[PDB]
Design a protein around this ligand. Structure first.
Ligand SMILES: CSc1cccc(Nc2ncc3cc(-c4c(Cl)cccc4Cl)c(=O)n(C)c3n2)c1
Length: 275
C-alpha cells in the first residue's frame, strides 16, 4: 500500500452511481491542474477484515502496474471512512455492453485493434506473474479513444463459459488458462458481444468442449483471427500461444491490414431460397 497515493476525502466528489452492490458502490466522480474525472469504488462501514484485505489488496495490486492497457490507479482513501479506491474513468464502460449497444458500428480493423490492446495488457500481466482468472469482455473497460484496458484485480474476483478445461477440472489457473479466456474474448469482440455458446447450459458447455466442439466462426471474421482464437482453445495447455505470440500476430495483421480482408467461411444457421 505504501506505493499508493493517499487522497484526502475533500478532493473527491461522487457524482453518479455506475456499478456494484452489497458492500459498496462504484461512482463516476471528479478528483481535485484542474479536476479530472475518476471512478470511485467504496467500502461501507461494517466491512470485515477479509473484505478490507481484499479491497485494499486490489488497490495494492493495481498500484504495482503501469501499462497503457491496464486500468490506472489514482489513489486510495484508507485513513477516512468510507474507504475508497480511485481510478481513471473509462468513458465508454464495459466492453461487452459497449459492443452490444454499438452493433456493427466499427471497422474490422478497429475491432482487431481492441484485441491487440487487450492482448498487450494481458502480456504485461502474465510477464508480471499475475494470473487474471476472470478475463472476459465484461472485465475490459473502454475509453473515448477506444482503448481497451483490463480491470478487476485481486483474488476476491468460476465463469464456466470463459474458463479453460484444466481450470474447471482441477483448479489449475495459469497465464495459459488466461489465453483460453482471451480466445473467448476474441469471439466476444468479433461478434459484438454475443453470449458464448448461446443457450447451452454450463454442463452442456463443459461436455461440448470435452468432446472437442469449439465456438463457430463469427460473421465477417478474418480467417487469421479465427485461426488464432482456435489455437487459444487447444485442450493441451502447452500447445496454446503465449501472450507474446498473440501480441506479435495481431501487430503484424494490423500493420498489414489487407491481411484482414481474407474472411473465414461462416456457417449459416438459416437458408433463404428465392426464385
Ligand atoms: C458498463 S459499467 C460503466 C458505465 C459507465 C462508465 C464506466 N466506466 C468505468 N470506469 C472506471 C471504472 C473503474 C472501476 C474500478 C474501481 Cl473504481 C476500483 C477498482 C477496480 C475497478 Cl475495475 C470500476 O469498477 N468501474 C465500474 C469503472 N467503470 C463503466
Amino acid at each position: 500500500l505504501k506505493f499508493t497515493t493517499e487522497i484526502h476525502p475533500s478532493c473527491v466528489t461522487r457524482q453518479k452511481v455506475i456499478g456494484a452492490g452489497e458492500f459498496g458502490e462504484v461512482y463516476k466522480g471528479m478528483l481535485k491542474k484542474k479536476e479530472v474525472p475518476v471512478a470511485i469504488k467504496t467500502l461501507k462501514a461494517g466491512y470485515t477484515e477479509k473484505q478490507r484485505v481484499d479491497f485494499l489488496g486490489e488497490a495494492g495490486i493495481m498500484g504495482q502496474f503501469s501499462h497503457h492497457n491496464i486500468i490506472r490507479l489514482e489513489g486510495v482513501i484508507s485513513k477516512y471512512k468510507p474507504m475508497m479506491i480511485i481510478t481513471e474513468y473509462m468513458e465508454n464502460g464495459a466492453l461487452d455492453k459497449f459492443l452490444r449497444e454499438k452493433d456493427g458500428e466499427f471497422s474490422v480493423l478497429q475491432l482487431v485493434g481492441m484485441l491487440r490492446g487487450i492482448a498487450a495488457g494481458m502480456k504485461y500481466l502474465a510477464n508480471m506473474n499475475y494470473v487474471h482468472r476472470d478475463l472476459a469482455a465484461r472485465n475490459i473497460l473502454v475509453n473515448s479513444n477506444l482503448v481497451c484496458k483490463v480491470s478487476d484485480f485481486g483474488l476476491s474476483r468460476i465463469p464456466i463459459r470463459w474458463t479453460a478445461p484444466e481450470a474447471i477440472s482441477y483448479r489449475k489457473f495459469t497465464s495459459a488458462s488466461d489465453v483460453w479466456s482471451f480466445g473467448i474474448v476474441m469471439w466476444e469482440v468479433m461478434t459484438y458481444g454475443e453470449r458464448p455458446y448461446w443457450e447451452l447450459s454450463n454442463h452442456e458447455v463443459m461436455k461440448a468442449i470435452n468432446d472437442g466442439f469449439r465456438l463457430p466462426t463469427p460473421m465477417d471474421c478474418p480467417s487469421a483471427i479465427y485461426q488464432l482464437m482456435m489455437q487459444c482453445w487447444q485442450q493441451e495447455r502447452a500447445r496454446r500461444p503465449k501472450f507474446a505470440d498473440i501480441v506479435s500476430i495481431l501487430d503484424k495483421l494490423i500493420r498489414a491490414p489487407d491481411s484482414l480482408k481474407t474472411l473465414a467461411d461462416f456457417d449459416p444457421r438459416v437458408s433463404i431460397r428465392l426464385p
